[PDB]
Design a protein around this ligand. Structure first.
Ligand code: VRQ
Ligand code: MG
Ligand code: MG
Ligand code: MG
Lengths: 405, 550
């Protein structure tokens, strides 16, 4: 009933981001959703004296349209409030064998928002062909997607969960945005049961809830060298190039014995027997790549970065790092195709972002291999998460596709 | 007439106070004009005479037959809060739905018909000068939205939306667009009752204080609107006039690409690429820019097309939306959108390179993207595409392309020029083809350099190069190996720069060298291009390096 005061950082004005144009089908969906949110008191119409704006999108998490607000700009502009002033990430969640994600964002609509801050939540439902000024609303309650909402609701969440963490001391519960991450070491069937108890405990305390992960299996992919029956000059040149690249990372790699096999000016297609010294050197280089890198630590103050490469045939490689060549994690995502490139990239971005949330508690900045406007047009057609990471668009063609392959 | 509409509250930007700009003195005729305008405005409640305690002022002037009062709100506008930006875009004629009847109402004195927040009126104070400051001047303030104040467009539109809502509620047949101080009303009623519904809306607005033009006094078709001509069955742009000049300034060229851009939304085939290249010398808008031969040809071709007249049709939501694209050459593209085969909603162009080197399929996909974004804005959906490229061509490209790409539903239309891959690099080295180890180098100071090769058949060569960079020489080495090889060649380079540019498989470039390489790659049958790290003694590569360095 009483509201928590909320402030923006020093000398920071609210968000003024532009609403992206939408298909008639997404607009009609937004107008229905908002017409009902207005009847329930959750949002109210606003007048021209509010200049603020945050973009909104319609997506599907099912057959029922859902509304998603891009509070990325408002989040940067409140961040001291929800990063310093309020809310903590546990290191053991990546270790559990099962982790289930529970959407608990509907709990926020039970809590009024500071009347002096509501103007900063303004958003616009666009019209087609600029026929009419968009429909303009702001929020009366805590909105999904604002980093303030979990921070304001934290105390209530601790009270509702405290019974359950009593009964189950070895189960880990981490909150990020509108979701709860619940990790056990239990057998799967026991795990889903422990999850069901928590849902029922949540529901009977007035918190409606509508995805299971296994961080045990994640890892950093070791670099893999080919194994051929007959090598040509081209295969040795590729092999020497890849190993040359890998030695910015692993120091012990040697190429002397391998490149000796190429002394002279030889035809690319010429079969070169792998001498014994060369073969032993290659064999040693395969063992060096088995180990991991040495001095690669997560710094919580620095941004996480995810690069992604298209490998064709539905495979995408990714690396997460904070400083170049110093990968905290690397991976390859696969798609059992009826699929397309944007569905695949969009899906990969959500996996990487979840993985990043579980491991470090924040989302990485993506370097996406796609044309900006193509991304801006189709990303909602497959987006199901309720958060939105930062991204930029790399237009330089990675020639390192082959290496991370 | 002033409105019993509620007022929007208004604040100055935090920590700012109201303007105090002194009133410049005026001629006794201008001073008499303002006294008579202000008393007529006082009578209608639009302004009120204020005491002496108001500390604010904004200069006022007069001009002309009918004199008009004008106020300089620059200083107050700098001090008032920001508002929700009023509509920037405007409706596009190709998006208007066909309607049997359409009416245009101009709201008169629109801003002066709307009340202004009470607490904010003090900051509008102005002053009519007394002759030779003999006595004090007359202090006035506004009670309605001033003309030229920052808030007026947004609060007037806000007020007009609210006013219309009750009338729209009890008339779900009529369609009302608002734009500036106009309303455009469309229906499919019998022109008689449509004249009736118009008369009702007029009276509804007249009750809220909004005067509207007497029927048989309201504009008639075709409407000159934001550079358009709107006929009841068709639309087109207003006539375009491209100057003839012996010399051209930067400013003259901007005005020229401007009008052509405008023309291209309905005149198929407009081109501006060679013209806009001229303006890469963005400088003083006065700097005279000598014209290119390609710019002369472009502009001439444009005048040819502007000679015949063209029109677009309006939109019918039940019919499909369709986009067709044709190549224009030299990297320029043209497209039409339509529902019925020769009745275009609109047309447009696309010429961007967005990079030094590209190829046709990438540009076609970019063109499909620009159309997709435009269709959503204008109609709220994406069209079906008819495109001059076969599925095999596009599938092969988008599958090998490192970047992610969305392929709409489209159909092959067989209308040359078709879009094709002029060449394709080999994916595997070529047996029985000579292997060229290439390299180049230049002195970063003298800018002199050399390109050469060393092959497996024992051939070697070095060519001298003047005023070049390490990067250009590395492509020059590749060009040399193409020139001196048979129809199949394996080339090996240590240049990531040069590899990247060729692996991307361009068919068009800004580089004369790269265009030459492209010509060579087309004439070959099989080319394999391979990379090795420099200065690692690979062999082949080591010998060209020693060669080219000596
Ligand atoms: C005249 C023929 C025509 O447009 N037709 C048959 C169909 C589309 O038009 C409309 C359709 C509707 Cl549902 C409402 C208003 C319309 O008309 C205008 C829509 C937007 C801006 C306008 C600007 C002016 C001026 N000046 C006049 C009319 C406008
Ligand atoms: Mg918005
Ligand atoms: Mg460009
Ligand atoms: Mg070199």
């Amino acid at each position: 009933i009483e509201t928590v005061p909320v402030k923006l950082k020093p000398g920071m004005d609210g968000p003024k981001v532009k609403q992206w144009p939408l298909t008639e089908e997404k607009i009609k969906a937004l107008v229905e959703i908002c017409t009902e949110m207005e009847k329930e008191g959750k949002i109210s119409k606003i007048g021209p004296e509010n200049p603020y704006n945050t973009p909104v999108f319609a997506i599907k998490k099912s057959t029922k349209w859902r509304k998603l607000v891009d509070f990325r700009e408002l989040n940067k502009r409140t961040q001291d409030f929800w990063e310093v002033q309020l809310g903590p990430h546990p290191a053991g969640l990546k270790k559990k064998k099962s982790v289930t994600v529970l959407d608990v964002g509907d709990a926020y609509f039970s809590v009024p928002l500071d009347e002096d801050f509501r103007k900063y939540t303004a958003f616009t439902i666009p019209s087609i062909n600029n026929e009419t000024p968009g429909i303009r609303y702001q929020y009366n309650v805590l909105p999904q997607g604002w980093k303030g909402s979990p921070a304001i609701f934290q105390s209530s969440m601790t009270k509702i969960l405290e019974p359950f963490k009593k009964q189950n001391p070895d189960i880990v519960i981490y909150q990020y945005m509108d979701d709860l991450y619940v990790g056990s070491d239990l057998e799967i069937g026991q795990h889903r049961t422990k999850i069901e108890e928590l849902r029922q405990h949540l529901l009977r305390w007035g918190l409606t809830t509508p995805y299971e992960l296994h961080p045990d299996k994640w890892t950093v992919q070791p670099i893999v060298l080919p194994e051929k029956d007959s090598w040509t000059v081209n295969d040795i040149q590729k092999l020497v190039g890849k190993l040359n690249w890998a030695s910015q990372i692993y120091p012990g790699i040697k190429v002397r014995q391998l490149s000796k096999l190429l002394r002279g000016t030889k035809a690319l297609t010429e079969v070169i027997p792998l001498t014994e010294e060369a073969e032993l050197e290659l064999a040693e280089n395969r063992e060096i790549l088995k180990e991991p890198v040495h001095g690669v630590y997560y710094d919580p103050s620095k941004d996480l970065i995810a690069e992604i490469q298209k490998q064709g045939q539905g495979q995408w490689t990714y690396q997460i790092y904070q400083e170049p060549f110093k990968n905290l994690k690397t991976g390859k995502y696969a798609r059992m195709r009826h699929t397309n490139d944007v569905k695949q990239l969009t899906e990969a971005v959500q996996k990487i972002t979840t993985e990043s949330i579980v491991i470090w508690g924040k989302t990485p900045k993506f370097k996406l291999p796609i044309q900006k406007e193509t991304w801006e047009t189709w990303w909602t057609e497959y987006w199901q998460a309720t958060w939105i990471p930062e991204w930029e668009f790399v237009n330089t063609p990675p020639l390192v596709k082959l290496w991370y392959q | 007439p002033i409105s019993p509409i509620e007022t929007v509250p208004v604040k100055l930007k935090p920590g700012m106070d109201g303007p105090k700009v002194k009133q410049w003195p005026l001629t006794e005729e201008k001073i008499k004009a303002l006294v008579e305008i202000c008393t007529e405005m006082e009578k209608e409640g639009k302004i009120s005479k204020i005491g002496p305690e108001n500390p604010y002022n904004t200069p006022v002037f007069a001009i002309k037959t009918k004199w008009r009062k004008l106020v300089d709100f620059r200083e107050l506008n700098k001090r008032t809060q920001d508002f929700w930006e009023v509509q920037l875009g405007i409706p596009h004629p190709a998006g208007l739905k066909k309607k049997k009847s359409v009416t245009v109402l101009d709201v008169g004195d629109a801003y002066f018909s709307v009340p202004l927040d009470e607490d904010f009126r003090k900051y509008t104070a102005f002053t009519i000068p007394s002759i030779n400051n003999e006595t004090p001047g007359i202090r006035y303030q506004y009670n309605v939205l001033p003309q030229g104040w920052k808030g007026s467009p947004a609060i007037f539109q806000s007020s007009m939306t609210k006013i219309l809502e009750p009338f729209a509620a009890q008339n779900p047949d009529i369609v009302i667009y608002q734009y500036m101080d106009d309303l455009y009303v469309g229906s499919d009623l019998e022109i008689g009752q449509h004249r009736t519904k118009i008369e009702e809306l007029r009276q509804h607005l007249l009750r809220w204080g909004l005067t509207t033009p007497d029927k048989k006094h309201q504009k008639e078709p075709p409407f000159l609107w934001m550079g358009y001509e709107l006929h009841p069955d068709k639309w087109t742009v207003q006539p375009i006039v491209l100057p003839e000049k012996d010399s051209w300034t930067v400013n003259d060229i901007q005005k020229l690409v401007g009008k052509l851009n405008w023309a291209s939304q309905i005149y198929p085939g407009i081109k501006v690429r060679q013209l806009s290249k001229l303006l890469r010398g963005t400088k003083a808008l006065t700097e005279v820019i000598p014209l290119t031969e390609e710019a002369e040809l472009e502009l001439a071709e444009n005048r040819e097309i502007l000679k015949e007249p063209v029109h677009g049709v309006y939109y019918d939501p039940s019919k499909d939306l369709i986009a067709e694209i044709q190549k224009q050459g030299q990297g320029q593209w043209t497209y039409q959108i339509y529902q019925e085969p020769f009745k275009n909603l609109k047309t447009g162009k696309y010429a961007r390179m967005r990079g030094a080197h590209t190829n046709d399929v990438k540009q076609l996909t970019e063109a499909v993207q620009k159309i997709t974004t435009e269709s959503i804005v204008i109609w709220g959906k994406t069209p079906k595409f008819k495109l001059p490229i076969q599925k095999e061509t596009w599938e092969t490209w988008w599958t090998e392309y490192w970047q992610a790409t969305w392929i709409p539903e489209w159909e092959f239309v067989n209308t040359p020029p078709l879009v094709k891959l002029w060449y394709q690099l080999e994916k595997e080295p070529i047996v029985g083809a000579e292997t060229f180890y290439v390299d180049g180098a230049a002195n970063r100071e003298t800018k002199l350099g050399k390109a050469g090769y060393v092959t497996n058949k024992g051939r070697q060569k070095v060519v001298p190069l003047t005023n070049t960079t390490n990067q250009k020489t590395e492509l020059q080495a590749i060009y040399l190996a193409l020139q001196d090889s048979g129809l199949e060649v394996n080339i090996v380079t240590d240049s990531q720069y040069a590899l990247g540019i060729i692996q991307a498989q361009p068919d068009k470039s800004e580089s004369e060298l790269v265009n030459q390489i492209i010509e060579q790659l087309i004439k070959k049958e099989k080319v394999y291009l391979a990379w090795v790290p420099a200065h690692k003694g690979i062999g082949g590569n080591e010998q060209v390096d020693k060669l080219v360095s000596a």
